[PDB]
Design a protein around this ligand. Structure first.
Ligand SMILES: [Zn+2]
Length: 209
């Protein structure tokens, strides 16, 4: 049911998505261990993900959440990194895309920092890095992130020192770093239908000069 529509680098939509990727890179406290060493990306392709059934699943849950939260879906655009991008874009988010051992519970994780999501592209903590070179900082191999539409509803605020159910009365969790004042938030959802993978971004990390 999924088709992928290539966006032109001249299209304003491509440019707004690239800008959100590039502008939300930060330094990581592991010195690049998980995601590699880089300050910016080479964006190779941005594709719009189109799937009527997955979209309608998303908008149906969005209306439910909105009705439970003073008519406010609290919808965001957020990054998601995973070796299972190919299955997500075809079949949607589900429990197999849950990070069972994450800090904010067994759910599906999203990030404001593209570079946080990049740490998960090859597995938890970057796994063993790219398939070809076993390099977590591979500058050659192509990586993929999703830039997703996510319904947060009433989000439980969990300050952090950096499938389950939402905390009662809530629709998501906000993991808000309280020590590193330049790290942006992460969010966790517990129903796959509260996210739609809008864009598939193909990229390489770039070796700093
Ligand atoms: Zn590689």
């Amino acid at each position: 049911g999924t088709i992928l529509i290539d966006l032109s680098p001249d299209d304003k939509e491509f440019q707004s998505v690239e800008e959100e990727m590039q502008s939300t890179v930060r330094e990581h406290r592991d010195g690049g261990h998980a995601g590699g060493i880089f300050n910016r990306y080479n964006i190779l392709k941005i594709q719009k993900v189109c799937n009527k059934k997955l979209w309608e699943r998303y908008t149906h849950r969005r209306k439910e959440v909105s009705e439970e939260n003073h008519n406010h879906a609290n919808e965001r655009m957020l990054f998601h990194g995973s070796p299972f991008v190919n299955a997500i874009i075809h079949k949607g988010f589900d429990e197999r895309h849950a990070y069972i051992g994450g800090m904010f519970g067994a759910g599906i994780y999203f990030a404001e920092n593209s570079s946080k999501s990049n740490q998960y592209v090859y597995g938890i903590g970057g796994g063993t890095g790219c398939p070809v070179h076993k390099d977590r900082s591979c500058y050659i191999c192509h990586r993929q992130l999703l830039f997703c539409r996510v319904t947060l509803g009433k989000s439980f605020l969990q300050f952090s020192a950096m499938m389950a159910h939402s905390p009662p009365g809530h629709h998501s969790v906000t993991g808000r770093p309280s020590v590193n004042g330049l790290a942006l938030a992460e969010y966790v959802i517990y129903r796959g239908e509260q996210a739609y993978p809008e864009y598939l971004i193909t990229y390489q990390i770039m070796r700093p000069e």
